[PDB]
């Protein structure tokens, strides 16, 4: 049924956002409302639309200035917070750029301030020739025409190319709108503005993977083995100019259908490129994905050789963890997609039971997927807030929670260990090796002497201090 | 020799040193018991700052958003503020204080925060006749100042709100102390100093419990300790000791103007002299003697620093960046130990104030090497100077400058905020005698590890 | 999984882990107020040890030599002992205790130390009628044991001497505490724990003041605080708490046999469980409750370590060397934080004792990885194993191992004695809850710097 939690008695509109799956229900009657306005003052976990554009997607690129047209905070706030390495020395994580908007610019306009900042950035780093300009709350409100500024700068500086995104934080209700605006602007303005050499009979884009802890680099070892050319990665370890070539690919392989389905859908409509949805987390899922890719290209045997080798390498370790994780209860409190990517893969491959899931910004589509794959007796929460998390903990008693680090630090007080469901602990987590990495972190989080020690009150004469025995795969 | 003040020569920023005003106002607010700041603007302005505090402290702190969306950005956001206040009050029955913090968005669209507060006070009085919730308007447009100025603005607004409600009463016999933006370990050290001097004081804000235990009963103790009552009692103090010109002195000035509580602004107590002068001012205002225990702690610090100064520190060139009170204070500490702070970077538009800081003249009169003080600086200003050939032996600053030091192969000591890329720093004092000792030993230890990794006379670390 | 004990397979030593017995006896003695040890042997046996203490503590400690020369090697050295005692007594009017420490030379030649003591006692009685000087014979041949054994022997002899003179008196109500060979910071911590538990206790030896101030009056305060009267009162204690099997427990056993003071030996309090078990023992013998403040310090430690264990420590392989009580205790601490102590090195000939240590069984029943414990080890045994391909992520040990870690490019935390190549370590606790937290943090910070210098996922240090 839908659930009205005790902490929500005064915001009873939350009942429509929380589903407890029970036997025999027609799930079609219980789909949480999702992607609706946030309730003020709740300590919702949601971020803003600008985040979804610059932090999540655009900022992943290795060779592009990320010009944030706004006051300095939006830039400071999106710097030193992500884990998406590159193969060029992590340029993307080392720098952030602001137009340092001041009151004069609010009153009289910020377009000259943006122009000057763009020239400065290109002057200070003469090897960098690509830029994305993002609007933020105040620059959107005052109506600065960043597309016009960018066209002037490109006329004055023939060596550069600039893309613009209008994505103030108050747009939409969450990070999701930022995804959408970026996707649709990029296909409309930049795809089909360059071509690259095709070096394989088999070509794809990999859409919706952002190289968290090297996930894209790990997957690339599969594509290189198979002989498949990736025209563009959207956007993990990617380049701005690769993304201008996406129309060239034979196949679009999508992992994050939430952030990046938009561009896949448009590339199919405009260019005829089929969209293949996969799961690039999960051991048996990754094998299914490789088999579908290879079936599409008519390279089935190559795929079987790769899969056999990876199972021989990694399956024994995965099974070691499965034996010790079977039956443990997990909660996943992340953006959305990881819920549907992980609920059944952790169950199938590790024996782990996902008892509670919360999505900051998922759409109804993401709930359809997660409820299809998820368990009876599990809570499914759209746009969860902090008090709800405490009540859900009481209700389901997880052994581990996959969530962000600040929530991890809160639930530690309750003696519940966490794994960073966003940036990972010791990743990468995609692929065959990556699921073993995930499993290891889950095992070390749960089988941790510190948790047992923290429970002991040394003042209690009836209590001793235990010693716990661990293992390693 | 010459101490030159110069502004950043670029309009834009690369690698900002500070966050925006609202972030600093959130930091002020989280130090108050039974307080949840409400940040009126888009969601990022809240969530990214909750993350920043988790990076520095490895803890959660509660801050709420009004969740400004497109409707409110076009037609006004008053109803979001009003709804957010009520939703907080309904769901947090112990909540007492809500600083309502504006952002760029809600400054640009002109929302009337004082009006929304009147509306909310009526609504709260009607719905919760036995509670008192203090709503403080905090005007923090991000297109002025920085987190430093936002902190100061929030402290001042919250004190104005609470003391307006309670006014002056019984003299408390206590000092007010505004340390500025310091770590829990700094607050621990100040509490020890006052205890050893037999001086009763409230430290605003008391963030000692931000380093909270994992307890057997699973209780959550990660809260500010400064209460409404503590704040209200500021109007009744003997005197205010303000340790940071840019981080709370304007509240001490307000309490002097409103309540006749004399404010004594001293140099922020980085290093030996500045600590000595702070203790002298406490003894003057209170009539209490400085105790032998502090003479001993002083002496232990000097003994430790003397094992390092002429051997390892002399003539070594240092760049320092951070909050202005910290930059100027650490530059003074560096010269006590024979370091040469040749480049000081301060990160906001407050240069008209910095030029009049008496510590700049104090540096002018003790330095025998040129010093460049860049105001309105970003961290690109540091990286660009190193690229152009500035030879540094040490960087002192916060963790968002880490890649500059890493790539230039320069040892770096983490000071100020945020210090997320090392463990436990928030627990270690930087001010006072113990803090000068700890800072000096971190500097030496960073240098020692660098000599090993670079094989630069690594054999010398035996009989120093 | 197996915990295997094996001896060094070579006859000779390359890179000794410990010094000889007389050096440990000296260390014992310098913790006593108004004590100057007299080392009966050649001059190097004193001067090199005074240097070693200056390396560790960055302080001078007074130790005299009998200056054995060629004539004494042919005819015996007793006249050198007897002259040395009188020259000390004549020139140091406040001297009270002289441990007379033998060396390899004077053991080989068989000088009659107890006979020289009788001579000296008569001479001192006649020349200084109102003074009492306690001369303790300390037999410390360097060709057995190590400085660990020598420390233990010296404490015991001193205790025997002074308690023989004074005997049993009125019950003191106090605990005797033998922490073993620990830093001033460890002593500071124990004093705090006893104070918070309202337990009166003498800590033998009380070396807090080895970290002495540089004072305005130029006074020298670098002395041990344990007095004759404190040692004599040992006979009247309620109980003895011995924290180190190899570093003082035999004196607790002597006081049990002689004066019926019951001795309780506990695991040395490295890590959480061993500290918990210590505090339970204190509570049991004194009938005093463990205070809330210690529950909170424990919880703060746990919270800090939980930020580290599964993210950075799990499955990381550690080698540990140092004193036996430290090596066994640190191995237990490591396992609490998910480190894997795969190689433990203990540096002397007491293997027949170590095979019976209950902590070996405690390892055997907890570890999931093989552990090699090499006894009679030198530091070449660590280097050689690395060169043969042992993969280590961390070394924990004293500074004389530094070049092993430097050259292998393995991060190293400095623990035990001597820690001369980093600043201030003598002031930081390693035992207790605060000590566990500080050790864990040192480990992490060493790892973090290593990641930076080696560019090994250095981008990860942002949101842990
Ligand atoms: S919801 Fe998002 S992060 Fe917020 S402002 Fe808006 S685009 Fe940006 Fe920016 S400067 Fe600071 S952090 Fe805000 S108050 Fe403005
Ligand atoms: S005067 Fe010189 S240093 Fe002394 S012993 Fe003689 S040659 Fe040597 Fe050696 S082992 Fe220890 S330090 Fe001595 S007691 Fe023997
Ligand atoms: Mg000293
Ligand atoms: Mg903590």
PDB file of N, CA and C in Angstrom, chain B residues 55 58-59 209 211-214 221 296 299-300 303-304 307 402-403 406 409 414 420-424 427 437 441 445 448-450 452-453 455 458-459 461-464, chain C residues 55 58-59 209 211-214 221 296 299-300 303-304 307 402-403 406-407 409 414 420-424 427 437 441 445 448 450 452-453 455 458-459 461-462 464:
ATOM      1  N   UNK B  55      32.410  17.430   4.346  1.00  0.00           N
ATOM      2  CA  UNK B  55      33.811  17.246   3.936  1.00  0.00           C
ATOM      3  C   UNK B  55      34.725  17.695   5.069  1.00  0.00           C
ATOM      4  N   UNK B  58      33.327  15.641   8.631  1.00  0.00           N
ATOM      5  CA  UNK B  58      32.854  14.260   8.527  1.00  0.00           C
ATOM      6  C   UNK B  58      31.645  14.039   9.438  1.00  0.00           C
ATOM      7  N   UNK B  59      30.736  15.028   9.387  1.00  0.00           N
ATOM      8  CA  UNK B  59      29.466  14.934  10.062  1.00  0.00           C
ATOM      9  C   UNK B  59      28.352  15.571   9.240  1.00  0.00           C
ATOM     10  N   UNK B 209      31.009  20.090  20.286  1.00  0.00           N
ATOM     11  CA  UNK B 209      30.323  18.843  20.069  1.00  0.00           C
ATOM     12  C   UNK B 209      30.105  18.471  18.588  1.00  0.00           C
ATOM     13  N   UNK B 211      32.487  17.421  16.981  1.00  0.00           N
ATOM     14  CA  UNK B 211      33.217  16.142  16.999  1.00  0.00           C
ATOM     15  C   UNK B 211      32.486  15.211  17.994  1.00  0.00           C
ATOM     16  N   UNK B 212      31.479  14.508  17.520  1.00  0.00           N
ATOM     17  CA  UNK B 212      30.574  13.844  18.379  1.00  0.00           C
ATOM     18  C   UNK B 212      30.921  12.389  18.467  1.00  0.00           C
ATOM     19  N   UNK B 213      30.603  11.762  19.575  1.00  0.00           N
ATOM     20  CA  UNK B 213      30.900  10.351  19.722  1.00  0.00           C
ATOM     21  C   UNK B 213      29.954   9.437  18.961  1.00  0.00           C
ATOM     22  N   UNK B 214      30.361   8.197  18.715  1.00  0.00           N
ATOM     23  CA  UNK B 214      29.492   7.065  18.336  1.00  0.00           C
ATOM     24  C   UNK B 214      29.288   6.358  19.700  1.00  0.00           C
ATOM     25  N   UNK B 221      24.658  13.474  19.089  1.00  0.00           N
ATOM     26  CA  UNK B 221      25.085  14.590  19.936  1.00  0.00           C
ATOM     27  C   UNK B 221      25.799  15.707  19.110  1.00  0.00           C
ATOM     28  N   UNK B 296      53.687  27.974  31.584  1.00  0.00           N
ATOM     29  CA  UNK B 296      54.294  26.633  31.253  1.00  0.00           C
ATOM     30  C   UNK B 296      53.916  26.174  29.829  1.00  0.00           C
ATOM     31  N   UNK B 299      55.842  28.066  27.481  1.00  0.00           N
ATOM     32  CA  UNK B 299      57.234  27.627  27.507  1.00  0.00           C
ATOM     33  C   UNK B 299      57.440  26.316  26.793  1.00  0.00           C
ATOM     34  N   UNK B 300      56.511  25.372  26.876  1.00  0.00           N
ATOM     35  CA  UNK B 300      56.579  24.109  26.149  1.00  0.00           C
ATOM     36  C   UNK B 300      56.507  24.367  24.647  1.00  0.00           C
ATOM     37  N   UNK B 303      59.810  25.857  23.501  1.00  0.00           N
ATOM     38  CA  UNK B 303      60.857  24.838  23.488  1.00  0.00           C
ATOM     39  C   UNK B 303      60.759  24.037  22.222  1.00  0.00           C
ATOM     40  N   UNK B 304      59.536  23.627  21.846  1.00  0.00           N
ATOM     41  CA  UNK B 304      59.323  22.817  20.659  1.00  0.00           C
ATOM     42  C   UNK B 304      59.673  23.619  19.388  1.00  0.00           C
ATOM     43  N   UNK B 307      63.434  23.975  18.595  1.00  0.00           N
ATOM     44  CA  UNK B 307      64.087  22.785  17.938  1.00  0.00           C
ATOM     45  C   UNK B 307      63.960  22.799  16.404  1.00  0.00           C
ATOM     46  N   UNK B 402      44.831  21.916  -2.779  1.00  0.00           N
ATOM     47  CA  UNK B 402      45.732  20.813  -2.736  1.00  0.00           C
ATOM     48  C   UNK B 402      46.446  20.532  -4.042  1.00  0.00           C
ATOM     49  N   UNK B 403      45.724  20.597  -5.155  1.00  0.00           N
ATOM     50  CA  UNK B 403      46.375  20.226  -6.397  1.00  0.00           C
ATOM     51  C   UNK B 403      47.490  21.227  -6.788  1.00  0.00           C
ATOM     52  N   UNK B 406      50.424  19.828  -4.863  1.00  0.00           N
ATOM     53  CA  UNK B 406      50.776  18.494  -5.325  1.00  0.00           C
ATOM     54  C   UNK B 406      51.527  18.617  -6.632  1.00  0.00           C
ATOM     55  N   UNK B 409      54.937  20.128  -6.435  1.00  0.00           N
ATOM     56  CA  UNK B 409      55.827  19.420  -5.488  1.00  0.00           C
ATOM     57  C   UNK B 409      56.322  20.332  -4.375  1.00  0.00           C
ATOM     58  N   UNK B 414      47.685  21.973   5.934  1.00  0.00           N
ATOM     59  CA  UNK B 414      46.303  22.265   5.860  1.00  0.00           C
ATOM     60  C   UNK B 414      45.856  23.062   7.056  1.00  0.00           C
ATOM     61  N   UNK B 420      39.548  18.864   4.298  1.00  0.00           N
ATOM     62  CA  UNK B 420      38.984  17.592   4.052  1.00  0.00           C
ATOM     63  C   UNK B 420      39.902  16.479   3.615  1.00  0.00           C
ATOM     64  N   UNK B 421      41.105  16.863   3.164  1.00  0.00           N
ATOM     65  CA  UNK B 421      42.010  15.853   2.637  1.00  0.00           C
ATOM     66  C   UNK B 421      43.053  15.347   3.592  1.00  0.00           C
ATOM     67  N   UNK B 422      42.891  15.612   4.866  1.00  0.00           N
ATOM     68  CA  UNK B 422      43.614  15.001   5.950  1.00  0.00           C
ATOM     69  C   UNK B 422      42.658  14.684   7.069  1.00  0.00           C
ATOM     70  N   UNK B 423      43.066  13.768   7.953  1.00  0.00           N
ATOM     71  CA  UNK B 423      42.251  13.255   8.972  1.00  0.00           C
ATOM     72  C   UNK B 423      42.495  13.961  10.304  1.00  0.00           C
ATOM     73  N   UNK B 424      41.412  14.348  10.962  1.00  0.00           N
ATOM     74  CA  UNK B 424      41.444  14.827  12.336  1.00  0.00           C
ATOM     75  C   UNK B 424      41.799  16.290  12.578  1.00  0.00           C
ATOM     76  N   UNK B 427      40.075  18.690  15.096  1.00  0.00           N
ATOM     77  CA  UNK B 427      40.268  18.434  16.501  1.00  0.00           C
ATOM     78  C   UNK B 427      41.540  19.062  17.060  1.00  0.00           C
ATOM     79  N   UNK B 437      52.451  25.428  18.658  1.00  0.00           N
ATOM     80  CA  UNK B 437      53.290  24.220  18.741  1.00  0.00           C
ATOM     81  C   UNK B 437      52.814  23.234  17.668  1.00  0.00           C
ATOM     82  N   UNK B 441      54.934  21.964  14.401  1.00  0.00           N
ATOM     83  CA  UNK B 441      55.281  20.563  14.206  1.00  0.00           C
ATOM     84  C   UNK B 441      54.663  20.028  12.930  1.00  0.00           C
ATOM     85  N   UNK B 445      56.918  18.401  10.080  1.00  0.00           N
ATOM     86  CA  UNK B 445      56.673  17.060   9.627  1.00  0.00           C
ATOM     87  C   UNK B 445      56.367  16.965   8.142  1.00  0.00           C
ATOM     88  N   UNK B 448      59.737  17.289   6.546  1.00  0.00           N
ATOM     89  CA  UNK B 448      60.539  16.096   6.723  1.00  0.00           C
ATOM     90  C   UNK B 448      60.099  15.000   5.717  1.00  0.00           C
ATOM     91  N   UNK B 449      58.790  14.777   5.607  1.00  0.00           N
ATOM     92  CA  UNK B 449      58.331  13.811   4.681  1.00  0.00           C
ATOM     93  C   UNK B 449      58.756  14.208   3.243  1.00  0.00           C
ATOM     94  N   UNK B 450      58.710  15.496   2.905  1.00  0.00           N
ATOM     95  CA  UNK B 450      59.098  15.957   1.588  1.00  0.00           C
ATOM     96  C   UNK B 450      60.591  15.696   1.337  1.00  0.00           C
ATOM     97  N   UNK B 452      62.278  13.257   2.534  1.00  0.00           N
ATOM     98  CA  UNK B 452      62.394  11.829   2.248  1.00  0.00           C
ATOM     99  C   UNK B 452      61.955  11.446   0.899  1.00  0.00           C
ATOM    100  N   UNK B 453      60.777  11.929   0.496  1.00  0.00           N
ATOM    101  CA  UNK B 453      60.244  11.549  -0.795  1.00  0.00           C
ATOM    102  C   UNK B 453      61.094  12.090  -1.950  1.00  0.00           C
ATOM    103  N   UNK B 455      64.379  12.837  -1.625  1.00  0.00           N
ATOM    104  CA  UNK B 455      65.780  12.526  -1.329  1.00  0.00           C
ATOM    105  C   UNK B 455      66.625  13.811  -1.233  1.00  0.00           C
ATOM    106  N   UNK B 458      67.933  13.706   3.193  1.00  0.00           N
ATOM    107  CA  UNK B 458      67.074  12.966   4.083  1.00  0.00           C
ATOM    108  C   UNK B 458      67.786  12.393   5.347  1.00  0.00           C
ATOM    109  N   UNK B 459      69.071  12.226   5.128  1.00  0.00           N
ATOM    110  CA  UNK B 459      69.998  11.762   6.202  1.00  0.00           C
ATOM    111  C   UNK B 459      70.141  12.703   7.359  1.00  0.00           C
ATOM    112  N   UNK B 461      67.865  14.014   9.273  1.00  0.00           N
ATOM    113  CA  UNK B 461      66.777  13.960  10.272  1.00  0.00           C
ATOM    114  C   UNK B 461      67.109  13.099  11.475  1.00  0.00           C
ATOM    115  N   UNK B 462      68.373  12.960  11.813  1.00  0.00           N
ATOM    116  CA  UNK B 462      68.874  12.063  12.872  1.00  0.00           C
ATOM    117  C   UNK B 462      69.210  12.766  14.193  1.00  0.00           C
ATOM    118  N   UNK B 463      69.930  13.888  14.138  1.00  0.00           N
ATOM    119  CA  UNK B 463      70.513  14.516  15.327  1.00  0.00           C
ATOM    120  C   UNK B 463      70.243  16.011  15.390  1.00  0.00           C
ATOM    121  N   UNK B 464      69.061  16.386  14.917  1.00  0.00           N
ATOM    122  CA  UNK B 464      68.527  17.708  15.018  1.00  0.00           C
ATOM    123  C   UNK B 464      67.985  17.898  16.382  1.00  0.00           C
TER     124      UNK B 464
ATOM    125  N   UNK C  55      68.067  12.250  20.967  1.00  0.00           N
ATOM    126  CA  UNK C  55      67.467  12.071  19.650  1.00  0.00           C
ATOM    127  C   UNK C  55      65.940  11.918  19.828  1.00  0.00           C
ATOM    128  N   UNK C  58      64.724  15.246  22.357  1.00  0.00           N
ATOM    129  CA  UNK C  58      65.276  16.549  22.127  1.00  0.00           C
ATOM    130  C   UNK C  58      65.551  17.284  23.492  1.00  0.00           C
ATOM    131  N   UNK C  59      66.062  16.490  24.456  1.00  0.00           N
ATOM    132  CA  UNK C  59      66.461  16.946  25.748  1.00  0.00           C
ATOM    133  C   UNK C  59      67.697  16.231  26.211  1.00  0.00           C
ATOM    134  N   UNK C 209      57.397  15.464  32.717  1.00  0.00           N
ATOM    135  CA  UNK C 209      58.196  16.626  32.635  1.00  0.00           C
ATOM    136  C   UNK C 209      59.459  16.508  31.765  1.00  0.00           C
ATOM    137  N   UNK C 211      59.104  16.621  28.733  1.00  0.00           N
ATOM    138  CA  UNK C 211      58.779  17.666  27.798  1.00  0.00           C
ATOM    139  C   UNK C 211      58.728  18.959  28.635  1.00  0.00           C
ATOM    140  N   UNK C 212      59.867  19.576  28.840  1.00  0.00           N
ATOM    141  CA  UNK C 212      60.020  20.681  29.716  1.00  0.00           C
ATOM    142  C   UNK C 212      59.937  22.000  29.045  1.00  0.00           C
ATOM    143  N   UNK C 213      59.461  23.012  29.729  1.00  0.00           N
ATOM    144  CA  UNK C 213      59.379  24.343  29.131  1.00  0.00           C
ATOM    145  C   UNK C 213      60.705  25.058  29.062  1.00  0.00           C
ATOM    146  N   UNK C 214      60.777  26.019  28.152  1.00  0.00           N
ATOM    147  CA  UNK C 214      61.759  27.100  28.158  1.00  0.00           C
ATOM    148  C   UNK C 214      61.103  28.286  28.907  1.00  0.00           C
ATOM    149  N   UNK C 221      63.648  22.114  34.217  1.00  0.00           N
ATOM    150  CA  UNK C 221      62.618  21.309  34.778  1.00  0.00           C
ATOM    151  C   UNK C 221      62.531  19.931  34.193  1.00  0.00           C
ATOM    152  N   UNK C 296      32.569   8.675  26.475  1.00  0.00           N
ATOM    153  CA  UNK C 296      32.546   9.655  25.427  1.00  0.00           C
ATOM    154  C   UNK C 296      33.917   9.661  24.674  1.00  0.00           C
ATOM    155  N   UNK C 299      33.948   6.812  22.422  1.00  0.00           N
ATOM    156  CA  UNK C 299      33.089   7.001  21.291  1.00  0.00           C
ATOM    157  C   UNK C 299      33.590   7.977  20.231  1.00  0.00           C
ATOM    158  N   UNK C 300      34.314   8.985  20.693  1.00  0.00           N
ATOM    159  CA  UNK C 300      34.964   9.909  19.760  1.00  0.00           C
ATOM    160  C   UNK C 300      36.059   9.176  18.967  1.00  0.00           C
ATOM    161  N   UNK C 303      34.328   6.938  16.451  1.00  0.00           N
ATOM    162  CA  UNK C 303      33.777   7.675  15.340  1.00  0.00           C
ATOM    163  C   UNK C 303      34.891   8.053  14.323  1.00  0.00           C
ATOM    164  N   UNK C 304      36.063   8.468  14.811  1.00  0.00           N
ATOM    165  CA  UNK C 304      37.162   8.868  13.969  1.00  0.00           C
ATOM    166  C   UNK C 304      37.704   7.661  13.184  1.00  0.00           C
ATOM    167  N   UNK C 307      35.642   6.481  10.167  1.00  0.00           N
ATOM    168  CA  UNK C 307      35.813   7.215   8.947  1.00  0.00           C
ATOM    169  C   UNK C 307      36.912   6.666   8.051  1.00  0.00           C
ATOM    170  N   UNK C 402      63.831   3.826   9.335  1.00  0.00           N
ATOM    171  CA  UNK C 402      63.306   4.733   8.346  1.00  0.00           C
ATOM    172  C   UNK C 402      63.770   4.458   6.917  1.00  0.00           C
ATOM    173  N   UNK C 403      65.088   4.079   6.749  1.00  0.00           N
ATOM    174  CA  UNK C 403      65.555   3.938   5.391  1.00  0.00           C
ATOM    175  C   UNK C 403      64.964   2.719   4.689  1.00  0.00           C
ATOM    176  N   UNK C 406      61.723   4.252   3.346  1.00  0.00           N
ATOM    177  CA  UNK C 406      62.017   5.263   2.367  1.00  0.00           C
ATOM    178  C   UNK C 406      62.367   4.589   1.051  1.00  0.00           C
ATOM    179  N   UNK C 407      63.325   3.640   1.109  1.00  0.00           N
ATOM    180  CA  UNK C 407      63.813   3.044  -0.119  1.00  0.00           C
ATOM    181  C   UNK C 407      62.789   2.137  -0.792  1.00  0.00           C
ATOM    182  N   UNK C 409      59.627   2.671  -0.674  1.00  0.00           N
ATOM    183  CA  UNK C 409      58.484   3.533  -0.945  1.00  0.00           C
ATOM    184  C   UNK C 409      57.200   3.005  -0.273  1.00  0.00           C
ATOM    185  N   UNK C 414      55.704   6.296  12.718  1.00  0.00           N
ATOM    186  CA  UNK C 414      56.676   6.203  13.745  1.00  0.00           C
ATOM    187  C   UNK C 414      56.029   5.950  15.102  1.00  0.00           C
ATOM    188  N   UNK C 420      62.986   9.823  16.413  1.00  0.00           N
ATOM    189  CA  UNK C 420      63.750  10.997  16.220  1.00  0.00           C
ATOM    190  C   UNK C 420      63.545  11.762  14.893  1.00  0.00           C
ATOM    191  N   UNK C 421      62.992  11.098  13.908  1.00  0.00           N
ATOM    192  CA  UNK C 421      62.917  11.693  12.584  1.00  0.00           C
ATOM    193  C   UNK C 421      61.541  12.361  12.275  1.00  0.00           C
ATOM    194  N   UNK C 422      60.752  12.570  13.343  1.00  0.00           N
ATOM    195  CA  UNK C 422      59.556  13.394  13.191  1.00  0.00           C
ATOM    196  C   UNK C 422      59.494  14.220  14.459  1.00  0.00           C
ATOM    197  N   UNK C 423      58.740  15.314  14.429  1.00  0.00           N
ATOM    198  CA  UNK C 423      58.639  16.265  15.508  1.00  0.00           C
ATOM    199  C   UNK C 423      57.448  15.975  16.384  1.00  0.00           C
ATOM    200  N   UNK C 424      57.676  16.005  17.677  1.00  0.00           N
ATOM    201  CA  UNK C 424      56.648  16.000  18.670  1.00  0.00           C
ATOM    202  C   UNK C 424      55.973  14.727  19.056  1.00  0.00           C
ATOM    203  N   UNK C 427      55.016  13.624  22.655  1.00  0.00           N
ATOM    204  CA  UNK C 427      53.910  14.305  23.360  1.00  0.00           C
ATOM    205  C   UNK C 427      52.545  13.704  23.002  1.00  0.00           C
ATOM    206  N   UNK C 437      42.904   6.721  18.479  1.00  0.00           N
ATOM    207  CA  UNK C 437      42.449   7.719  17.455  1.00  0.00           C
ATOM    208  C   UNK C 437      43.676   8.409  16.799  1.00  0.00           C
ATOM    209  N   UNK C 441      44.719   8.111  12.861  1.00  0.00           N
ATOM    210  CA  UNK C 441      44.878   9.284  12.082  1.00  0.00           C
ATOM    211  C   UNK C 441      46.260   9.450  11.466  1.00  0.00           C
ATOM    212  N   UNK C 445      46.893   9.686   7.523  1.00  0.00           N
ATOM    213  CA  UNK C 445      47.590  10.810   6.952  1.00  0.00           C
ATOM    214  C   UNK C 445      48.853  10.422   6.231  1.00  0.00           C
ATOM    215  N   UNK C 448      47.637   9.065   2.999  1.00  0.00           N
ATOM    216  CA  UNK C 448      47.139  10.126   2.121  1.00  0.00           C
ATOM    217  C   UNK C 448      48.284  10.876   1.438  1.00  0.00           C
ATOM    218  N   UNK C 450      51.192   9.639   0.896  1.00  0.00           N
ATOM    219  CA  UNK C 450      51.751   8.715  -0.056  1.00  0.00           C
ATOM    220  C   UNK C 450      50.974   8.696  -1.381  1.00  0.00           C
ATOM    221  N   UNK C 452      49.307  11.084  -2.690  1.00  0.00           N
ATOM    222  CA  UNK C 452      49.635  12.309  -3.390  1.00  0.00           C
ATOM    223  C   UNK C 452      50.966  12.263  -4.062  1.00  0.00           C
ATOM    224  N   UNK C 453      51.986  11.847  -3.297  1.00  0.00           N
ATOM    225  CA  UNK C 453      53.352  11.821  -3.857  1.00  0.00           C
ATOM    226  C   UNK C 453      53.454  10.820  -5.044  1.00  0.00           C
ATOM    227  N   UNK C 455      50.796   9.729  -6.831  1.00  0.00           N
ATOM    228  CA  UNK C 455      49.676   9.908  -7.763  1.00  0.00           C
ATOM    229  C   UNK C 455      48.834   8.649  -7.864  1.00  0.00           C
ATOM    230  N   UNK C 458      44.833  10.045  -6.081  1.00  0.00           N
ATOM    231  CA  UNK C 458      44.893  11.146  -5.112  1.00  0.00           C
ATOM    232  C   UNK C 458      43.615  12.013  -5.134  1.00  0.00           C
ATOM    233  N   UNK C 459      42.859  11.884  -6.202  1.00  0.00           N
ATOM    234  CA  UNK C 459      41.563  12.544  -6.356  1.00  0.00           C
ATOM    235  C   UNK C 459      40.516  12.009  -5.393  1.00  0.00           C
ATOM    236  N   UNK C 461      40.536  11.806  -2.154  1.00  0.00           N
ATOM    237  CA  UNK C 461      40.595  12.371  -0.785  1.00  0.00           C
ATOM    238  C   UNK C 461      39.648  13.541  -0.593  1.00  0.00           C
ATOM    239  N   UNK C 462      38.556  13.553  -1.303  1.00  0.00           N
ATOM    240  CA  UNK C 462      37.611  14.679  -1.291  1.00  0.00           C
ATOM    241  C   UNK C 462      36.357  14.427  -0.488  1.00  0.00           C
ATOM    242  N   UNK C 464      35.370  11.365   1.358  1.00  0.00           N
ATOM    243  CA  UNK C 464      35.433  10.248   2.240  1.00  0.00           C
ATOM    244  C   UNK C 464      34.880  10.593   3.540  1.00  0.00           C
TER     245      UNK C 464
END
